[model samples]
Target: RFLKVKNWETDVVLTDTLHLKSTLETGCTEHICMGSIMLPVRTKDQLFPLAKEFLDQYYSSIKRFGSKAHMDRLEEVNKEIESTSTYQLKDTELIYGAKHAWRNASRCVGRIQWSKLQVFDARDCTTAHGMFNYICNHVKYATNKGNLRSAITIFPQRTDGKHDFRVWNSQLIRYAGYKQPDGSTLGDPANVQFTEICIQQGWKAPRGRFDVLPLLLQANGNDPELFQIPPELVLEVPIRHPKFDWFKDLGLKWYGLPAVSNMLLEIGGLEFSACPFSGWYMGTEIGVRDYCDNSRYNILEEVAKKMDLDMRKTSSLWKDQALVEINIAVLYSFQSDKVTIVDHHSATESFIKHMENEYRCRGGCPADWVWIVPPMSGSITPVFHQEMLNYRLTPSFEYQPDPWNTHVWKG
Candidate 1:
């Protein structure tokens, strides 16, 4: 058994298959680090250098490095960036880096299927109306009649500070949270403020726990506008347990797809400020985090009560039983509806294989152990005992500040 600190630059052996032949120097040391969660901005001095490096990465990714075409394109991009503040990425570059972006994501275990991701280009979108239509089509395509697929619809890149495009909501699809007079929230507690913002924008609040919120879209730096997702496209599965007849009567349901809309996508020195991406759920996301987290729906106590468990006794192990049943319902309900979902065990195995594949091809793969390990099982899962290195990489999805924080808006 040996433990050694690595100088990542010199020690880690990466090949061109790692997508970028170069690695970003992170602000991390052998001691405790914050490199995993921090979203530090890149330097501004030389866009061309980063641009050339990304082009090389792209060319190498496609097995065309050092060619006359690659050499000529680099010169063209240099002139383009010199003329303006930024250059455009070729369509293939957008698609290639999109897959590579997720492949390099350390936090996600679902990346075992990263290569199958679909890329949708909406670079010509110039208004909120245009964005709404594109997102609707993208949502429909990914939903795939319950056989979910991964997809990202890329809007225009960031322009000068004045016209950077933005998606106001943190997620493309989420329920509203109505703040009540009793200081209670009526829906997903996570979205109370965003719900208020949508209502403030003159949206008619349906005032239900499962009511889907309208999309707050901003483009060309215009005031954000409200666009309701059509009910016809929203696919929901009613949560029910196969063994418990009463479970169906409890009447909980969840949306079919999960799409995070606010993250900025960085590729080849180009930043896409409004790229919305989606993939199928892993069941426990709904069962554990969204449904049972105390700050979320807090359905644990209710589920335990329905099963006639003594709430006062922690030794009864009622909490774990309830969690198991809820997860069972989530998996069973989705399966019964022919919707796509994965259990944590299968997902964990797939991720282990992904790591093996990466180790063989690139020699080192970045992984965030905190997020990689399932929230429920620790030490039982194989990843719990394994050491992982977390570092930031380009072709990344990064969190950006919400638009309302900086931009003045009118309803």
Candidate 2:
């Protein structure tokens, strides 16, 4: 699919800044797409086939195709499947396969750093308490005291489809939201449900604008347990524009580490249901995603009002000015903290380089052009002009339905 969107009611119903036709077979209309929908869970019949395909591909990649070890391992896998209906990846296999998945991900613009990722294998963890320890270790390493490193903490996978080890929080570090008695809210609006879930599980809301949420660790099929992320492990950047003296007074700040703790890591017929992966942020991620989105913090009007812009007039371009300043503050504030962050220009430049390197090494690269473009400054960026092919690639990270949806806690 081309991954285009149109709004008929609002505007001219114009196509995106870039669009190309001629694709699609499985699920798409001329106008509609099911790109965001979750794929069906794999059935038992599809299991062995997928396992064999990935094994062959992995062995082939390592220059071991048809070698004695490759064939013998396949036999070993077959016997494991014959008895337990599942098998495990060797440590080397997990490391290599995860990097391959990162490279194959269609939605990542930061795959240039794929090779550098430090894989923290927490598969040995069998208890919720152990999961918290492992998660804390991941946060520490990934935080790097704000120099931030790319990494993934892979918890145990789902073979039985029921006993999955998972993280309940979307990110390892996020602010808590509180719905107040006066029908107002504090903290991030995005986290109200999850925050409520945490409170329901016996977490006390500290009632702050940016209180860090705690870990909800589900080990195997057991009930999820709560554990506070040690405050010292979190590194934060206080938002301040280099030019605006008043920016610091606004008290905007964010954690440096962005560990997404809920994505599934699919590799070599295994599903790591709790692989928390991360990279350093691009400025707009904090600027646009955290601050500007109305559904999120909704700080646009606050910043615009502080700047004394004519908010009464649409022609005044208050939102645009506020956006620029917020993004600038993200970059400047991150630099002030010595936190690892990237400008959109440099991030996209490396992605372009990554695209060329992929084409040179392999015949094609699967990329979601929709995600590759920077959220802000659409047409001005290089990724906006590029053509890309998007398709499902095995050894890829896939999104899954929330783990908490399957069950509610008794407490």
Candidate 3:
């Protein structure tokens, strides 16, 4: 069979042949393959020749520019890898690797501050309870009392030739979704399926739109556990427009930080599945993608109604007008609350500088142009005019199967 996938952001379309056996094994039907799908896997082989290749790169980079004393440590790491089929990274190595991974992330536009990452080493956390504490600390530090700093908390690596700690939440902070009786969702539509899973696992589902979900942690050889996030620790910004007083009556709000939790952090071939990382929000991420997306909050029509837009006419551009206002309101609310956020224009400019810096330093940069362009005002930004190449770069973050579907816990 064949499939066609549309890249809405880049105006690109991909058509590829699919094997029926492959689709069936992955539990994807024809219709599902036409869209995005994630296959569930029980375990990944922790041992691979790529481990040696990554270590060679790390050691070579260190020898090229680092202090002479670091060479001895690199030698030790190499010897350990050769002897025991396991390698360990020192604090400095881990920090550099995490920062570089952020810079090498193709989908991220906030790579300008990649070197300013704060890495928390939690590789020794052995219990779900301990992992919860580290996550809480990460949330508190990353939130930074609304100043929002880019941070990552790395849990244990996949040593011992087995899967280690994992954080199940797609993000450290997300709104709960409560399915109403009328087949509609009351909270973040993105989290509706996850909320259902959480409820099945003995959580009390608060049907509110802004209830923060708990951390789901799993350690080596243990069933997944749930830890509720403290309400006070999460910083939320109530959204209200500067001109429209009625906007406040909508009672809409969102969390301050967008700490992604589901990606695997591969540093020197060692995968840290529980290393949740975060960066400050761009206005369009919240306003356009989160709030305006049809499958998400789906508030475009609601906002258009409040703006008194002519919903009856497609040429009225009601959606476009509402999106711009929402973007403006997002920026205004974050600024009014003293929270850190960047508008799309500023973010795009910084990204161009990032590309320039990377080109001068590393000779080339791999950027997904589709993601580099903002959801609103794409052609207005410098990034929109720039050509980019997207390719694989190791010591990077990659998406993984959801812990729920992987049978971490059967509810």
Best-fitting candidate, scored by lDDT: 1
The TM-score values for the models, in the order shown, are 0.92, 0.90, 0.85
lDDT (Cα, tens digit) per residue for candidate 2, span 1-411: 224332222222222221231112325457877565445246546678778888887798899999999999889988887777778888888998889889878788898888898989888889999999988888898888888889988888886777788899999999999889997889998899999999988998898999999898898878899999889988988888889899899999998988887788887677899898888898888898889898888899989989999999889899999999999999998998899999999988899777767655665566777778888997777777776666666787777888778854444
Q: All candidates' lDDT scores?
A: 0.84, 0.82, 0.78
Give the alpha carbon lDDT tens digit for every residue of 9-88 in model 3: 45544433312211113233566641123222211234334554455556666765345554565566566766776677
Task: Specify the poorest-scoring 10-residue window by lDDT in model 3.
Answer: 17-26
The parts of candidate 1 lying over 4 Å away from their true place are 1-27, 35-44
Clashing pairs in 1: none
Clashes of 3: 0
User: What is the alpha-carbon lDDT for the whole of candidate 1?
Assistant: 0.84
Candidate closer to the true structure by lDDT (higher is better), 1 or 2: 1
Per-residue C-alpha lDDT of model 1 across residues 25-92, encoded as one tens digit per residue: 65666785765554542334567888888898888867889999999999999888878768888898
Whole-model alpha-carbon lDDT for candidate 3: 0.78
Model 3, TM vs. native: 0.85
**Order of the predicted models by lDDT, top scorer first:** 1, 2, 3
Q: Answer with 1 or 2, whichever has the higher TM-score.
A: 1
Clashing pairs in 3: none
